[PDB]
Design a protein around this motif. Structure first.
Motif, PDB file in Angstrom:
ATOM      1  N   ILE A  34       1.022  -1.123  -0.555  1.00 45.33           N
ATOM      2  CA  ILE A  34      -0.410   0.072   0.226  1.00 45.33           C
ATOM      3  C   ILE A  34       0.610   1.504   0.147  1.00 45.33           C
ATOM      4  O   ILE A  34       1.855   1.582   0.761  1.00 45.33           O
ATOM      5  N   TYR A  36       0.417   5.082   0.971  1.00 42.84           N
ATOM      6  CA  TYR A  36      -0.058   6.428   1.841  1.00 42.84           C
ATOM      7  C   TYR A  36       0.440   7.613   1.754  1.00 42.84           C
ATOM      8  O   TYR A  36       1.624   8.019   1.147  1.00 42.84           O
ATOM      9  N   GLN A  38       0.341  11.570   3.650  1.00 40.95           N
ATOM     10  CA  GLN A  38       0.452  11.868   4.632  1.00 40.95           C
ATOM     11  C   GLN A  38       0.667  13.741   4.427  1.00 40.95           C
ATOM     12  O   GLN A  38       1.786  14.101   4.643  1.00 40.95           O
ATOM     13  N   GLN A  42      -2.838  16.210   8.699  1.00 35.43           N
ATOM     14  CA  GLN A  42      -3.700  15.595   7.780  1.00 35.43           C
ATOM     15  C   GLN A  42      -3.549  14.109   8.216  1.00 35.43           C
ATOM     16  O   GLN A  42      -2.204  13.914   8.938  1.00 35.43           O
ATOM     17  N   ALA A  43      -4.648  13.707   8.434  1.00 36.10           N
ATOM     18  CA  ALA A  43      -4.455  12.243   8.860  1.00 36.10           C
ATOM     19  C   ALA A  43      -4.084  10.808   7.641  1.00 36.10           C
ATOM     20  O   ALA A  43      -3.749  11.920   6.518  1.00 36.10           O
ATOM     21  N   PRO A  44      -3.707  10.105   7.754  1.00 39.82           N
ATOM     22  CA  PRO A  44      -3.129   9.358   6.300  1.00 39.82           C
ATOM     23  C   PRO A  44      -4.222   8.999   5.934  1.00 39.82           C
ATOM     24  O   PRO A  44      -5.354   9.104   6.170  1.00 39.82           O
ATOM     25  N   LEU A  46      -4.861   6.847   2.369  1.00 44.28           N
ATOM     26  CA  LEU A  46      -4.441   5.224   1.355  1.00 44.28           C
ATOM     27  C   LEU A  46      -4.886   5.880   0.012  1.00 44.28           C
ATOM     28  O   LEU A  46      -6.125   5.692  -0.708  1.00 44.28           O
ATOM     29  N   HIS A  87       4.367   7.403   2.585  1.00 45.93           N
ATOM     30  CA  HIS A  87       5.503   5.607   3.297  1.00 45.93           C
ATOM     31  C   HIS A  87       4.340   4.666   2.254  1.00 45.93           C
ATOM     32  O   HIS A  87       3.237   4.954   2.284  1.00 45.93           O
ATOM     33  N   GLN A  89       4.141   0.517   2.808  1.00 44.49           N
ATOM     34  CA  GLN A  89       3.922  -0.439   3.649  1.00 44.49           C
ATOM     35  C   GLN A  89       3.404  -1.847   2.890  1.00 44.49           C
ATOM     36  O   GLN A  89       2.468  -1.963   2.027  1.00 44.49           O
ATOM     37  N   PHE A  98       6.195  -0.023   7.289  1.00 44.37           N
ATOM     38  CA  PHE A  98       6.041   1.186   6.728  1.00 44.37           C
ATOM     39  C   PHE A  98       7.511   1.153   5.870  1.00 44.37           C
ATOM     40  O   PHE A  98       8.633   0.959   6.695  1.00 44.37           O
TER      41      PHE A  98
END
Lengths: 107, 107
Positions: A34, A36, A38, A42-44, A46, A87, A89, A98
């Motif tokens: 995956i 991501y 960020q 803010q929030a991560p 996908l 990132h 993962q 990660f």
């Protein structure tokens, strides 16, 4: 236990640039990667799963490729809103792990 | 496609307090829940997986429980360094999805 390696740790580029960043897994993880995003504060989010599947509603200039141990995430046209840390993962094995992340800035 | 609901959206408490936050999945996800921690300015950190398994080296005052649709993440003694936003994530189905996050502050 799987180690993710990510490069580069940061880069600056211009709006419209094609940008590429890489992720390596310490063992064969097939396509279970995956990516991501960020953004500052803010929030991560996908962006991509199964190494190359763009998540619904995610901008179409993001793409991913690779299968096994070496993977790439590509932005076909860098945009201001891409200012963020990215990132990778692996989810081939728990715990999911990660990469170190890549800080991307728009010169 | 699975929706994660998280509550509360924020809370303030004192050092030493027992703190609990919840996550609900829109369907039965067994124990496939991860809890992440995101400190101000830092990368996300996996704290718990399989709903209740503490990741190696993660502080032992963090715990998680629940199986099916309703889950809880508990800090047995709030500490200054716990200042962060916490997100749950189901990995029963791709794409993995997050709860809205809980912003935790130490009064």
């Amino acid at each position: 236990d799987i180690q993710m390696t990510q490069s580069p740790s940061s880069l600056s580029a211009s709006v419209g640039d094609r940008v590429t960043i890489t992720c390596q897994a310490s063992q064969d993880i097939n396509n279970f990667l995956i990516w991501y995003q960020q953004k500052p504060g803010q929030a991560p989010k996908l962006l991509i799963y199964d190494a190359s599947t763009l998540e619904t509603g995610v901008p179409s200039r993001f793409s991913g490729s690779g299968s096994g141990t070496e993977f790439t995430f590509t932005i076909s046209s860098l945009q201001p809103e891409d200012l963020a840390t990215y990132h990778c993962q692996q989810y081939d094995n728990l715990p999911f792990t990660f990469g170190q992340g890549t800080k991307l800035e728009i010169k």
